[PDB]
Scaffold this active site. Structure first.
Site, PDB file in Angstrom:
ATOM      1  N   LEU B  36       0.821  -1.201   0.000  1.00  0.00           N
ATOM      2  CA  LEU B  36       0.000   0.000   0.000  1.00  0.00           C
ATOM      3  C   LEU B  36       0.860   1.258   0.000  1.00  0.00           C
ATOM      4  O   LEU B  36       1.822   1.379   0.763  1.00  0.00           O
ATOM      5  CB  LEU B  36      -0.932   0.009   1.212  1.00  0.00           C
ATOM      6  N   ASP B  37       0.497   2.198  -0.865  1.00  0.00           N
ATOM      7  CA  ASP B  37       1.119   3.511  -0.926  1.00  0.00           C
ATOM      8  C   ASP B  37       0.431   4.383   0.131  1.00  0.00           C
ATOM      9  O   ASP B  37      -0.577   3.983   0.720  1.00  0.00           O
ATOM     10  CB  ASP B  37       1.017   4.032  -2.367  1.00  0.00           C
ATOM     11  N   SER B  38       0.972   5.576   0.405  1.00  0.00           N
ATOM     12  CA  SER B  38       0.345   6.491   1.356  1.00  0.00           C
ATOM     13  C   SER B  38      -0.974   7.057   0.838  1.00  0.00           C
ATOM     14  O   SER B  38      -1.796   7.520   1.635  1.00  0.00           O
ATOM     15  CB  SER B  38       1.303   7.631   1.701  1.00  0.00           C
TER      16      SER B  38
END
Ligand code: CDL
Ligand code: PC1
Ligand code: ZMP
Ligand code: SF4
Ligand code: SF4
Ligand code: SF4
Lengths: 182, 81, 186, 208, 114, 105, 117
Positions: B36-38
């Site tokens: 997951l990215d931010s």
């Protein structure tokens, strides 16, 4: 061009008549449709109701055909504020980039037949702000235009000449003859 | 109860499209262990706000790493104790 | 005569500065004007008196309104009385045209003259300002008297050199009369 | 006698010179330079940190009631390090005078909003923001006032093109006014109106 | 190579990233109201994909004042999208409609003259 | 009253026939997305108001009050004069006092 | 004898303009007394407020005071005194009698921009 006819030549010419089609139709049904189209175009040219669409300075001359000297009311021409009740939209002013969807929506809510008069150099061709970042290069890229009135603030005789040219276009409309030939 | 909101949080995390159905656990974070990215972690926080029905402050939201911290703050909000 | 609320100075005039009158005659006069519509009766009489006035409608196009010899209308290219075209392709009009409508392309002709190969005026771009006829050293480009030149089609207002020369041939008498009656003002 | 030469007004020169020395003495923290130009106009050249405390001062002092603010003008000079300059023109009805307060501002560096001092700066500081990107901090609402809602960029910078980047046309497939990259039917003819001979010898060494 | 300036809307890059996340959160909440209140052909998932594409277009920036400038302009576009001042044509300007996709290969650009 | 029904049905029938023939005579063009849109000036797009509702309620109360002022023109020649005068003066005077009291408060 | 109206919209005729003007000038003096004596604003403000306090002390009539001061009506004098009090209470926070916080950069204030050297 053509040379306008000399009165010696023009005295031999017969009268033109009101109908641009002429009364020399062959079939009785074609003649009846021609006279019905003549009556329909007379009713349409007898009262065109332009819309109060005044964008910029050109509109100050637009009120000057409302003015008592020129008096648009004796030509069937009277202003209507709602776009549904109006026949004509007179683009009188400078169409900008924020003005484009408003003009397109106002034209699309107008009911057909729809004749459009471009009043002034900002309305047709862009004009004096043609190389501007936020001026549409004429309203012909958005709204389809039937009459183009030339002057930067058109004199009011020239705007009313555009109105009479629109009335001659409406008188030249062929609908029922095209239906008979469709 | 803690188990009800625990199952609710894990349900909402398995509702996410990018998260694979394996590696669902309370301890592991989303940043480095998971992909997951931010921009996806804030999508998980907006999924929390969509399912639970109340808004999370950002100053509370930036502290969060793992689902254990998720249960640790929503247990105070849901008033289970 | 009502008193002044604010003392009016020498160089100023005050509107709505009168005190409201409190004597019974003025109160009854204002009361009767309120109750019996006296000021509305004066407005109705002033309105009805304009029916009997002469209408100012000038009945276009049998009768056309006043113009001036300085009037700016359709641009046109003039000619010499011998018949040679006046425009020496000197390009001050395009340099002075604020909307940049004029496009001039020039080549040497067979006898050695300077006269143009292309002179285009975009009349949809032209603002009818008359800077070109003031910036014309010869009297080549000119504002003609014509303003009834509304077109059905957008491209027909893109004036070529031949259209301007035909406008100069057609409108030469009125343009020459205006230039004869107007050159000492300029 | 020279009747084709405009004669300056001496009573608008002496009063403005004394007031320029007065405002240089009263505010040495913000005012860098006061100058009386040709045409009898006084310019005050403030620091960007002194936008509010100078314009407040000229608003409320007994010796300077510059209570009217007529216009806030942004000039983009891209040669300088701080490219934008912001000019506040103030009118004093009590003493019947005018002043110009000029400051320098970059696009990233914010400027103090004079909306608490003069309420006309509620809109004028929007307009510069719409045309140069000068951000005015502590503004009520800093929106886009003149250009189109989907416009990207600030048009009155000298690094912006004259004809813009995009144009608009009606698409009857999408049934809407769509946005297209710019293609002019006739390009803007750039005229090289540069003077090869200098005409003002008084402005030759005016830069230092 | 270091100058002292006046901060605009932030004092550190973590604060600027946090306010950009506030902007993305408010845009993501305002997507289904934009799809509902506009007569646009794009759906909710396409609007969210376009929002992600416009954020990862500006992923590359690093400077605090530049990213705060981007956040300010994004909040202004969002405020023009909550209150309906933009039209259906202004919303569909993010998707490059009525534009032919220009080729990237040298042969097609050589034939087309680009 | 039976002739009034016939003439009212004939007016309704004539107006519906005229509108049906107008709908036939209307020029049928292609229907559009934007042409059917409700008109807001230019760019495309109310709650309950209590003040107008109490305006309608004041209109209703005064309408039912007028419906009792309506009969007494006929009754004036067929009733007791003292009773009729007392009721009419009391009726319009209490109406005027109520109107002036609602004006002052 | 009080005036009927001041001639301006939104300005009310002051019942006691002398006491209000004297109290406002005393508050301006008490505000500027905290400032250092080498500041020019304190000296100029003290001079003008002292001469206007002498003007409102010598003349007990309203019209004679407006003639003697000569800057508008006395309600405008109250407005100017409140404005100067606001200015002085802002000067005690801003402190503008110090040196320049930002000097002018090179080639900033010269107008013809592209001239070399
Ligand atoms: C299906 C059947 C067809 C249906 C559709 C019919 C459309 C008719 C309208 C139309 O566009 O016609 C163009 C069409 C083309 O005309 P044209 O041949 O090109 O022009 C004729 C001339 O060249 C040019 O015209 P003109 O210069 O000869 O003037 C036309 C007309 C004079 O013009 C008019 O009369 C125009 C109408 C004015 C009405 C004013 C009062 C209105 C009151 C309203 C209430 O002249 C006359 O009527 C003759 C002189 C009369 C002198 C009267 C003196 C009284 C004192 O006209 C005709 O075909 C005319 C004949 C058909 C019309 C009806 C005739 C019978 C009924 C007459 C009235 C009875 C009451
Ligand atoms: C749709 C209706 C529009 C409104 C019609 C209001 C008519 C007045 C109300 C009423 O009861 O009128 C009695 C009246 C009778 O009035 P009358 O009985 O006092 O008059 C005596 C009758 N004449 C005149 C013939 C001697 O009836 C009507 O008006 C009939 C209305 C028929 C409506 C048909 C469409 C429904
Ligand atoms: C119509 C429907 C919507 C269509 C799409 C509309 C897009 C509207 C927004 C476009 C304009 C913007 O605001 S984009 C600029 C915002 N700033 C950035 O993207 C900077 C990115 N930099 C960052 O550090 C972060 O914000 C991340 C990288 C996004 C957050 O950090 P995480 O820790 O990875
Ligand atoms: S065409 Fe000329 S008069 Fe008309 S709006 Fe444009 S500038 Fe004004
Ligand atoms: S200024 Fe006159 S002579 Fe010169 S190029 Fe133009 S039209 Fe021709
Ligand atoms: S009148 Fe003005 S706009 Fe028209 S061609 Fe002459 S210079 Fe150009």
């Amino acid at each position: 061009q053509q040379t306008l006819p000399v009165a010696e030549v023009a005295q031999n010419l017969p009268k033109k008549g009101y109908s641009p089609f002429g009364t020399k139709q062959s079939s009785v049904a074609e003649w009846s449709l021609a006279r019905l189209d003549d009556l329909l175009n007379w009713g349409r040219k007898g009262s065109i109701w332009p819309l109060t669409f005044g964008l910029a300075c050109c509109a100050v001359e637009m009120m000057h055909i409302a003015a008592p000297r020129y008096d648009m009311d004796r030509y069937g021409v009277v202003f209507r504020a709602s776009p549904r009740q109006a026949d004509v939209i007179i683009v009188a002013g400078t169409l900008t980039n924020k003005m484009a969807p408003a003009l397109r929506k106002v034209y699309d809510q107008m009911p057909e037949p729809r004749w459009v008069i471009s009043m002034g150099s900002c309305a047709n061709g862009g004009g004096y702000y043609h190389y501007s970042y936020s001026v549409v290069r004429g309203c012909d890229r958005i709204i389809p235009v039937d009459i183009y009135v030339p002057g930067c603030p058109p004199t009011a005789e020239a705007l009313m000449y555009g109105v009479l040219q629109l009335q001659k276009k409406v008188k030249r409309m062929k609908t029922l003859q095209m239906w008979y030939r469709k | 109860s803690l188990k009800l909101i625990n199952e609710r949080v894990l349900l909402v995390l398995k509702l996410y499209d990018k998260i694979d159905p394996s590696k669902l656990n309370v301890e592991s974070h989303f940043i480095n262990d998971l992909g997951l990215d931010s921009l996806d972690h804030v999508e998980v926080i907006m999924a929390m706000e969509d399912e639970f029905g109340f808004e999370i402050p950002d100053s509370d939201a930036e502290k969060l790493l793992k689902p254990a911290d998720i249960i640790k703050y929503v247990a105070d909000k849901e008033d289970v104790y | 005569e009502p008193k002044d609320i604010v003392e009016v100075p020498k160089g100023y005039v005050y509107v709505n500065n009168k005190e409201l009158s409190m004597e019974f005659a003025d109160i009854t006069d204002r009361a009767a004007s309120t109750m019996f519509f006296g000021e509305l009766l004066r407005g109705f009489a002033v309105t009805l008196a304009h029916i009997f006035k002469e209408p100012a409608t000038i009945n276009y196009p049998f009768e056309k309104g006043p113009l001036s010899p300085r009037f700016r209308g359709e641009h046109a290219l003039r000619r010499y009385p011998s018949g040679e075209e006046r425009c020496i392709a000197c390009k001050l009009c395009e340099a002075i045209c604020p909307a940049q409508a004029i496009t001039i392309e020039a080549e040497e002709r067979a006898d050695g003259s300077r006269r143009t190969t292309r002179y285009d005026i975009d009349m949809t771009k032209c603002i009818y300002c008359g800077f070109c006829q003031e910036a014309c050293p010869v009297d080549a480009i000119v504002e003609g008297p014509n303003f009834e030149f509304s077109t059905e089609t957008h491209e027909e207002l893109l004036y070529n050199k031949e259209k301007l020369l035909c406008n100069g041939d057609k409108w030469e008498s009125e343009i020459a009369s205006n230039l004869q009656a107007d050159h000492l003002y300029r | 006698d020279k009747p084709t030469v405009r004669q300056p007004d001496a009573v608008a020169r002496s009063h403005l010179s004394d007031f320029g020395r007065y405002v240089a003495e009263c505010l040495p923290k913000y005012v860098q330079k006061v100058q009386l130009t040709a045409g009898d106009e006084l310019e005050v050249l403030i620091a960007p940190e002194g936008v509010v405390p100078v314009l407040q001062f000229l608003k409320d002092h007994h010796q300077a009631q510059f209570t009217n603010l007529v216009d806030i003008a942004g000039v983009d000079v891209p040669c300088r390090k701080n490219r934008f300059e912001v000019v506040y023109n103030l009118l004093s009805l009590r003493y019947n005078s005018r002043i110009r307060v000029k400051t320098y501002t970059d696009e990233l560096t914010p400027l103090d909003s004079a909306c608490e001092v003069h309420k006309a700066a509620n809109w004028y500081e929007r307009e510069i923001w719409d045309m140069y990107g000068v951000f005015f901090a502590n503004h009520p609402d800093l929106r886009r006032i003149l250009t189109d809602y989907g416009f990207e960029g600030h048009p009155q910078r000298r690094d912006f093109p004259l004809s813009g980047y995009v144009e608009l046309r009606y698409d009857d497939e999408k049934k809407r006014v769509v946005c297209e990259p710019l293609e002019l039917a006739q390009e803007f003819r750039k005229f090289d109106l540069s003077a090869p001979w200098e005409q003002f010898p008084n402005f030759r060494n005016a830069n230092p | 190579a270091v100058q002292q300036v006046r901060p605009i809307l932030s004092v550190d890059r973590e604060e600027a990233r946090k306010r950009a996340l506030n902007l993305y959160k408010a845009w993501y909440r305002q997507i289904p109201y934009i799809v509902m209140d506009y007569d646009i052909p794009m759906t909710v998932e396409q609007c969210r994909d376009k929002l992600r594409e416009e954020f990862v277009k500006h992923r590359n920036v690093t400077d605090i004042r530049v990213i705060d400038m981007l956040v300010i302009k994004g909040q202004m576009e969002l405020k023009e999208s909550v209150e309906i001042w933009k039209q259906k044509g202004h919303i569909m300007r993010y998707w490059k409609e009525s534009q032919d996709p220009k080729p990237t290969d040298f042969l097609s650009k050589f034939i087309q003259g680009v | 009253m039976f002739s009034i029904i016939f003439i009212a049905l004939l007016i309704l029938l004539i107006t519906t026939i005229v509108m049906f023939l107008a709908s036939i005579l209307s020029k049928k063009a292609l229907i559009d997305r934007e042409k059917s849109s409700p008109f807001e000036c230019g760019f495309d797009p109310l709650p309950f108001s209590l003040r107008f509702f109490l305006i309608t309620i004041i209109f209703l109360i005064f309408d039912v009050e007028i419906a009792l002022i309506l009969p007494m023109i006929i009754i004036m020649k067929y009733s007791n004069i003292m009773i009729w005068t007392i009721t009419s003066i009391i009726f319009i005077l209490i109406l005027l006092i109520g109107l002036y009291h609602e004006w002052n408060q | 004898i009080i005036k009927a109206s001041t001639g301006l919209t939104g300005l009310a005729v002051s019942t006691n303009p002398h006491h209000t003007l004297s109290a406002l000038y005393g508050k301006i003096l008490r505000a500027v007394s905290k400032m250092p004596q080498d500041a020019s604003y304190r000296k100029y403000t003290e001079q003008l407020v002292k001469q206007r306090a002498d003007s409102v002390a010598q003349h007990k009539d309203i019209t004679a005071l407006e003639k003697a001061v000569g800057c508008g009506q006395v309600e405008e004098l109250i407005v100017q005194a409140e404005n100067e009090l606001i200015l002085a209470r802002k000067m005690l926070g801003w402190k503008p009698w110090e040196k320049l916080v930002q000097a002018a950069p090179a080639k900033q204030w010269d107008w013809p921009p592209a001239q070399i050297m």
